[PDB]
């Protein structure tokens, strides 16, 4: 069943779980990059730190 | 007597004494009933089960 | 009694933890049963919890650290005595009223849930008949006494420290609640219930070796285990109570505490009794007070 | 059934065959009583080979400790009645509610009174009542070893005796005066329970008192639920005999603690609350004299300053 | 699949209506029972 998984993460990830780890990793950066943009915007409103 | 703090037609002393007497009487009666019907009873009529063991 | 669900109202599969068996507790967390009544209870309880937590949180200006610090002493106040039974503006009693209504609906939905589920499985609904006592106490304290006197202000506030404050305030306002004929009976039944649980649990734990904890099989067929409890108590005090009678005693001692004490709370108002110590003076149970200062 | 091999047992065994001695209708008192009247196994018959006390005078097992408790009961009750009901403010029927016995005066400290001084009655009554309660404790111990049982009932009665011992001995001993006990007399003892605790500024803000209140309320709730379950399921005869109770709670309360588990939980619920109440009384007055301002340390904790 | 979701839905439709009605009634000017 485990086909598209990397060869090292065979004991841990089959196809089902690895395809979920992929989307979670991507979304982390889809909940990453957005949060950094937000903080940059809030920083140049009133800086909390010197 | 004119009791200011009355619960309906109940004077305070009557309420206290009645409560105590009723509690003691009920406790004694329930003790007797519970001790009588603890084990199976054997008489000339039959063998009555202990308390509730014949689902009837 | 709509029961929703997938398999006779139960969703999911059992979860088994073998560690609990070691300490003597059952190892299964079963399938969850979702019915109409328990769904209503859960929804209304979630709404009540949200209202309570958020009205408390708004008071500390949404400070999580201040919320954690003052959580115990924070409270939601009922309508003031001026409004009577009317609906005040929010943040001064409307929040209390909405939360109390939803909590009452949650309690009634839970009562219906247990009554329906007992009936469905074939056993008698004696758990709900016993829950009626706690329901009566809650109903009296929260609605019946305040609605009778026409003041929402005599019902407890919605906080952890608020319940203790309300207990002390009601005892002080109506004159030393220790002189309450029904709160005396209530204390008798509550302390007797604790004593009863102590002796019964200690007997069953001691007789665990003789399979005396299998009460269902010993009601119809006592066996040596039940006998070595009946004889123990007969030799200790001169009377015993087989498996059926002792559970009747437990149920009745627990239920009577609610009723005798709901009566006590109900009668503690200016219409019936205003001074419980003056009541005791008129009953002659007080140790005599003494002379007034000369002046 | 799945008893977790990698952890210590802590669970019951069911000895050999105490499951087939179940008569389907119940035995009478006539056959049951002679079965387990073994002559021996007493916390006296083991140390001193051969003891008595005309055992079993009716339903009751006399025992050496029963004799000790009878002596204590007789003397303590004589003293308590003689200066509570016999000598009091009003008539004897009314004196039952209003009679009192007061602790010795402060300047006595830790020391005996004289036969007639104000506090001799309290001392003698508490000493003889303690002796009677200890006798009852060891009589319960004796009856348990008679029937080859656990000592859980003696242990819980010991917890209650520990509450009494704390209140009437330990706090007076620690504070240096016998003038720290509680008044004997039903309404006077209520008055004392009020005044003590109000003199410590709203005893409700005691942590251990709150724990004891929780234990009491939870024990009553557990008693109600357990009695209701057994009463409801006693009449059921169907597919699942005893599990009809487990499945019912798993529908209601999604754990359903087992048959032995509920009894163990009730034991802990009853004893822990009273132990916490003992701690609350012990700490009341010795370290701290104000319970409202005892929480002053809560404000200055490092993470709460703003 | 859908019967449960209908009942749950409904009892939400009810709880939310109750909540909004209470909040509307508690507001001073919007109180139509005081005049």
């Amino acid at each position: 069943d485990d086909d598209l998984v990397p060869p090292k993460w065979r004991p841990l990830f089959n196809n089902q779980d690895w395809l979920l780890h992929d989307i979670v990793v991507k979304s982390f950066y889809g909940f990453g990059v957005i949060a950094a943009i937000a903080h940059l915007l809030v920083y140049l409103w009133k800086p909390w730190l010197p | 007597g004119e009791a200011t703090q009355m619960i309906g037609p109940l004077t305070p002393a009557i309420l206290c004494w009645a409560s105590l007497i009723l509690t003691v009487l009920g406790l004694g009666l329930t003790f007797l009933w519970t001790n009588i019907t603890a084990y199976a009873r054997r008489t000339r009529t039959g063998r009555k089960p202990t308390a509730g063991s014949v689902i009837k | 009694d709509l029961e929703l669900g997938r398999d006779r109202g139960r969703i999911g599969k059992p979860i088994e933890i073998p560690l609990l068996e070691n300490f003597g507790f059952d190892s299964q967390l079963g399938p969850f049963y979702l019915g109409f009544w328990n769904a209503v209870a859960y929804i209304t309880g979630g709404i009540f919890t949200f209202i309570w937590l958020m009205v408390m949180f708004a008071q500390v200006n949404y400070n999580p650290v201040a919320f954690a610090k003052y959580f115990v002493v924070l409270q939601i106040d009922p309508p003031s005595s001026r409004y009577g039974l009317s609906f005040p503006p929010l943040n001064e009693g409307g929040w209390w009223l909405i939360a109390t209504f939803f909590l009452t609906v949650s309690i009634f939905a839970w009562y219906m849930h247990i009554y329906t589920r007992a009936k469905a499985l074939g056993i008698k609904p004696y758990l709900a008949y016993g829950f009626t006592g706690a329901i009566a106490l809650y109903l009296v304290i929260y609605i019946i006494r305040p609605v009778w006197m026409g003041d929402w202000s005599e019902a407890p506030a919605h906080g952890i420290k608020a319940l203790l404050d309300w207990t002390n305030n009601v005892s002080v306002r109506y004159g030393n609640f220790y002189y309450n004929p029904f709160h005396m009976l209530s204390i008798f039944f509550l302390l007797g219930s604790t004593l009863l649980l102590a002796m019964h649990a200690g007997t069953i734990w001691a007789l665990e070796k003789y399979a005396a904890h299998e009460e269902w099989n010993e009601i119809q067929a006592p066996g040596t285990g039940t006998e070595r409890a009946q004889l123990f108590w007969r030799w200790c005090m001169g009377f015993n109570a087989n498996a059926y009678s002792i559970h009747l005693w437990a149920f009745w001692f627990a239920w009577l505490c609610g009723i005798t004490g709901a009566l006590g709370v109900f009668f503690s108002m200016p219409d019936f009794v205003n001074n419980w110590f003056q009541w005791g003076i008129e009953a002659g149970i007080n140790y005599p007070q003494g002379p007034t200062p000369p002046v | 059934k799945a008893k977790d091999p990698r952890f210590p047992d802590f669970s019951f065994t069911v000895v050999e065959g105490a499951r087939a001695t179940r008569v389907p209708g119940g035995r009478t008192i006539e056959e049951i009583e002679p079965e387990y009247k073994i002559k021996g196994r007493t916390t006296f018959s083991a140390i001193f080979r051969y003891d008595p006390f005309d055992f079993w005078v009716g339903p009751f097992y006399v025992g050496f400790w029963g004799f000790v408790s009878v002596i204590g009961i007789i003397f303590g009750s004589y003293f308590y009645i003689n200066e509570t009901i016999l000598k009091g403010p009003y008539s004897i029927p009314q004196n039952f509610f209003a009679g009192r016995i007061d602790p010795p005066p402060p300047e006595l400290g830790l020391g005996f009174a004289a036969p007639g001084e104000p506090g001799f009655a309290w001392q003698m009554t508490v000493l003889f009542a303690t002796i009677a309660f200890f006798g009852w404790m060891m009589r319960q111990v004796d009856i348990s070893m008679k029937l080859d049982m656990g000592y859980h009932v003696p242990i819980a009665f010991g917890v209650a005796f520990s509450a009494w011992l704390v209140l009437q001995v330990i706090r007076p001993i620690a504070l240096g005066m016998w003038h720290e006990g509680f008044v004997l007399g039903i309404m006077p003892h209520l008055d004392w329970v009020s005044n003590f605790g109000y003199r410590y500024n709203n005893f409700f803000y005691n942590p251990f008192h709150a724990i004891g209140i929780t234990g009491l309320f939870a024990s009553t709730w557990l008693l109600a639920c357990h009695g209701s379950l057994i009463l409801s399921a006693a009449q059921y005869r169907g597919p699942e005999g005893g599990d009809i109770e487990n499945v019912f709670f798993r529908d209601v309360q999604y754990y359903s603690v087992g048959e032995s588990g509920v009894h163990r939980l009730g034991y802990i619920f009853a004893i822990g609350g009273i132990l916490s109440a003992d701690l609350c009384i012990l700490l009341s007055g010795w370290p701290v004299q104000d319970w409202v301002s005892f929480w002053n340390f809560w404000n200055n904790l490092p993470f709460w300053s703003g | 699949p859908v019967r449960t979701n209908i009942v749950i839905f409904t009892i939400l439709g009810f709880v939310v209506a109750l909540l909004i009605h209470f909040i509307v009634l508690s507001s001073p000017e919007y109180n139509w029972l005081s005049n």
Partner: protein, 407 residues
């Protein structure tokens, strides 16, 4: 007697080790803390002596006034102030500007002032006086001291010498200052750190004894929901008695804080009332049974039954508390007259007093009014109060406490 003797040997050993460890712990406590606690305990409970203020006067850094006065703190300033007092009493043996202390010689004025007006406030001669010309009133502090000397006479004669079971204690200048000139503390740390931050509505009592429910008929400060602390302050500074104490009936002596009577308030007001009584308990360092019996809070017992948890002097303490609650409402009413300097804004920073000792009185001005803790400070009998048995009879007693301000 098999090998199971091991458990009883273990029990005996664990009992012996418990005995020895408890005994050694108490020996260590006696050796370190029991000793240190007893010297510290001896300091508490001692009366206030004029040397206490002289020590803080002479052991403080010199300060530089900005309002045109010489340094009044330090050993040198104290020395020259005393020397100038000697010179002045040498010059004029008869006073020339006294208006309150009429009938005193200049030597007794010098002696009384250098002790009980200097140590009492912990300030030297230079605070209110001009060293070169003593009799001249140049600074407002001297006018304030004059009016506040009048306050001592008025307060003593109106409230203190009238108290049932008086014990003998007068109020001197140190009783509320406590070697501090300005910014006195009216409420202790227990009050500020022990009163929850909740908003409550308070219903005051009407002259007949009933409650006023509609806001429009209420005093100004309580027409809105207020904090518990502010309602406590209102009750403290707005106390009246609607049922004067009649010994012939045991339900008399009810004031603004009465709850359990035929008219009666609701359960809500019990929280505010009990918090006011908690502040009173904290101020005196006593419990609730110092004046009350928990079986009923209304009674004036005189001779209570259960003495182990009660105060035998129950009713006298209750009546004294009532009279001083009236006193700390009379003070709020008449504070502008008795020489108190009005504060612009409530002081903040270092030196301020808790923000609750500062009040806005009738003439829209902020004053530092006294409170229950001001004169008590945790002691049921103020340690800075003077007993009549400690006052010498006659010529020497004129120096200690003037008969002019004795009442």
């Amino acid at each position: 007697s098999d090998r199971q003797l091991a458990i009883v040997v273990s029990v005996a050993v664990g009992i012996v080790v418990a005995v020895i460890t408890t005994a050694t712990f108490w020996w260590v406590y006696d050796l370190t803390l029991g000793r240190a606690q007893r010297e510290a305990a001896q300091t508490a409970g001692a009366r206030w002596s004029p040397s206490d203020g002289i020590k803080v006067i002479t052991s403080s850094p010199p300060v530089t006034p900005t309002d045109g006065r010489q340094n009044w703190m330090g050993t040198q300033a104290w020395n020259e102030g005393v020397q100038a007092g000697q010179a002045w009493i040498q010059q004029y043996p008869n006073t020339v500007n006294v208006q309150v202390l009429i009938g005193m010689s200049s030597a007794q004025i010098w002696t009384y002032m250098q002790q009980y007006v200097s140590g009492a406030l912990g300030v030297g001669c230079q605070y209110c006086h001009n060293i070169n010309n003593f009799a001249s009133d140049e600074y407002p502090q001297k006018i304030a001291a004059r009016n506040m000397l009048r306050l001592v006479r008025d307060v003593n004669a109106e409230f203190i010498v009238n108290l049932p079971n008086w014990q003998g204690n007068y109020v001197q200048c140190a009783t509320c200052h406590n070697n501090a000139p300005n910014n006195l503390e009216g409420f202790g740390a227990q009050f500020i750190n022990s009163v929850p931050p909740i908003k409550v509505t308070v219903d005051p009592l009407d002259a007949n004894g009933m409650a006023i429910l509609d806001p429009a008929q209420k005093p100004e400060a309580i027409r809105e929901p207020v904090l518990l602390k502010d309602a406590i302050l209102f009750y403290i500074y707005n106390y009246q008695v609607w049922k004067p104490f009649d010994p012939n009936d045991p339900e008399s002596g009810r004031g603004s804080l009465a709850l359990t009577y035929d008219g009666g308030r609701t359960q809500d007001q019990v929280t505010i009332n009990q918090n006011v009584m908690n502040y009173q308990a904290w101020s005196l360092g006593v419990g609730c049974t110092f004046c009350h019996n928990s079986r009923n809070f209304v009674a004036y017992e005189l001779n209570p039954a259960g003495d182990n948890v009660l105060n035998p002097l129950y009713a006298y303490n209750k009546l004294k508390a009532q009279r001083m609650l009236l006193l700390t409402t009379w003070l709020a009413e008449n504070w502008p007259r008795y020489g108190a300097i009005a504060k612009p804004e409530i002081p903040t920073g270092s030196g301020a007093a808790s923000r609750y000792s500062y009040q806005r009185l009738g003439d829209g001005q902020i004053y530092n009014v006294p409170g229950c803790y001001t004169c008590h400070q945790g002691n049921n009998i103020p340690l800075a109060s003077i007993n009549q048995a400690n006052i010498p009879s006659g010529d020497a007693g004129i120096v200690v406490l003037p008969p002019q301000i004795r009442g």
